[PDB]
Amino acid sequence: RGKFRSLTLINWNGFFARTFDLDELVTTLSGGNGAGKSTTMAAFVTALIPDLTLLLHGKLKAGVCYSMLDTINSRHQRVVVGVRLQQVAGRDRKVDIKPFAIQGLPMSVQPTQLVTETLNERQARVLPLNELKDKLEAMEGVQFKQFNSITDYHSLMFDLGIIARRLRSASDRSKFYRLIEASLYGGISSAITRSLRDYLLPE
Numbered sequence: 001r002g003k004f005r006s007l008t009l010i011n012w013n014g015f016f017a018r019t020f021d022l023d024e025l026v027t028t029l030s031g032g033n034g035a036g037k038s039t040t041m042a043a044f045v046t047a048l049i050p051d052l053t054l055l056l057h058g059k060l061k062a063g064v065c066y067s068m069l070d071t072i073n074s075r076h077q078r079v080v081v082g083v084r085l086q087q088v089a090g091r092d093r094k095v096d097i098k099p100f101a102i103q104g105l106p107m108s109v110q111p112t113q114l115v116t117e118t119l120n121e122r123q124a125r126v127l128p129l130n131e132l133k134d135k136l137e138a139m140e141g142v143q144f145k146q147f148n149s150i151t152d153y154h155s156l157m158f159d160l161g162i163i164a165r166r167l168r169s170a171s172d173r174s175k176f177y178r179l180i181e182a183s184l185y186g187g188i189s190s191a192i193t194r195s196l197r198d199y200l201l202p203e
Contacts, residue, residue: 002201003072008111009043017112030189036105050083050099054177064126068111073161074203084129099153104141108193164202
């Protein structure tokens, strides 16, 4: 079976850089109902089903934002899957989201460091997708792909052993979305662990 490594939020309202491993994710999603829990679920659900028709603006902060799922499939391959989110001009509504996938990323690279730049004198800065791309190109063996089709994002995820079922249409996504939701709401810890286990990183 696969291994869920972490959920990483970059520049979300309340979390400039926050990584949650399995235990912390489950604990956070199961506990108190406040803004933290709610912002974390949005990030989790948005990385899994990046479909603006199924779900955001006030949950993010101005500029580049990321929500990433760091994983290891049953083949023992590390796969990072995520989305770059952006509040558009003519705000308080428009949010642009682009899904991406990274293969072959060395363990020495953590998601937060991956997507940020902290120059000696400087303060942390989030890289836009174009800079991330160039940065990963430079790394031997790393394969990066952005998607314009949610269906393509999901196809790769299925091929890479990240998601147990194939999501071919918007209907498929609605159904999956409802499944995830039924398991993420309710404050029952074991239901969360159970859904991540049976819906993600199969075989």
